[PDB]
A paper describes a structure:
In the human pathogen Vibrio cholerae, the sodium-pumping NADH:quinone oxidoreductase (Na+-NQR) generates a sodium gradient by a so far unknown mechanism. Na+-NQR is composed of three integral membrane subunits, NqrB, NqrD, and NqrE, and three hydrophilic subunits, NqrA, NqrC, and NqrF.
Subunit NqrF consists of two domains, an amino-terminal [2Fe-2S] ferredoxin-like and a carboxy-terminal FAD-binding domain, which is similar to ferredoxin-NADPH reductases (FNRs). The C-terminal FNR-like domain catalyzes NADH oxidation, and the electrons are transferred via the ferredoxin-like domain to the integral membrane subunits NqrD and NqrE.
Author numbering: 128 to 405
The structure:
Amino acid sequence: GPVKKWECTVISNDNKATFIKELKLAIPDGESVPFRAGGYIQIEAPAHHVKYADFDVPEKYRGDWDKFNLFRYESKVDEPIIRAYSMANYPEEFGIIMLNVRIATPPPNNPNVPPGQMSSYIWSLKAGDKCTISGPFGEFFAKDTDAEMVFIGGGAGMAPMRSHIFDQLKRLKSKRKMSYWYGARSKREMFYVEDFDGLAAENDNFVWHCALSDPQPEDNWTGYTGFIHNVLYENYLKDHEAPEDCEYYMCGPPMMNAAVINMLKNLGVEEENILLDD
Ligand SMILES: Cc1cc2nc3c(=O)[nH]c(=O)nc-3n(C[C@H](O)[C@H](O)[C@H](O)COP(=O)(O)OP(=O)(O)OC[C@H]3O[C@@H](n4cnc5c(N)ncnc54)[C@H](O)[C@@H]3O)c2cc1C
Ligand SMILES: NC(=O)C1=CN([C@@H]2O[C@H](COP(=O)(O)OP(=O)(O)OC[C@H]3O[C@@H](n4cnc5c(N)ncnc54)[C@H](O)[C@@H]3O)[C@@H](O)[C@H]2O)C=CC1
Ligand code: NA
């Protein structure tokens, strides 16, 4: 009754990184989900059986798949399932839902356990497939203030970061000072580069930076390296006159969230200015 549902068509489902796919969904009749940036939807899947060997993984991203023999895996799901995924589009990107979905493979120290149910299903989807979503939901919303904003994302945590940043600069026409600090493992794992480069070129109040935590020899990389929290500290927060006056929004793997939070507390940032999704 109260929660709305849409039967969507898959527009595309391309790899954006070795272990991340961008699922793009078309909403029926060109309508839009009435969400807020930072929110999420629930995807549901029927019973199914999929093989990793059938995933479309481009050769550019296949290196670690071959290296760890990840095409061995199969996922057998006996009953319908449901999971949450965050919108990577912002609300005025009408008619679509964009998601960034990390494949949850078996842990390497435990390789024979079942692969992740829903991410394996999503990775099997191809253009033209149908996909049912409900919502929207969420609580990871921007504060309505004039404070400087610092966004920290890592890996698939890109999704709500993109939603938030575009919402501020395009829908809200914000003049707030904004920066985005994004951690990727190596150059091929970067994505949405055109999106944020364009925003920074058009908005004097927005800048962004990528740090590579494991740069590869073929990257010819001369930018920032290491964990993103160390890069943000060294190149911006260390010398900030008043880091406690900023609002920090972050989404990354658990160990990135913990390192960022620790660093901000050590700088005297208060918990009300440190925001994560639940
Ligand atoms: C609000 C919210 C927003 C989210 N947004 C996103 C998003 O934007 N993008 C995203 O990628 N995810 C997101 N997530 C996480 C997402 O919902 C899923 O939890 C994730 O995709 C994994 O689900 P799964 O069904 O693929 O894996 P599951 O089936 O839940 O399995 C999880 C992992 O456990 C492993 N495992 C299984 N059995 C065992 C065992 N016996 N021992 C050890 N390990 C085992 C699996 O191989 C897999 O690695 C979000 C979650 C929430 C709550
Ligand atoms: N809860 C939510 O709203 C959302 C959750 N996610 C989750 O985000 C996760 C992202 O994971 P991946 O893409 O595999 O990330 P990853 O392995 O590619 O790492 C991304 C970056 O995180 C940082 N990082 C990683 N390990 C670190 C450590 N030990 N210490 C400090 N920094 C570290 C590095 O800068 C690294 O480049 C996924 O598991 C996904 O489920 C994704 C989107 C939204
Ligand atoms: Na700029």
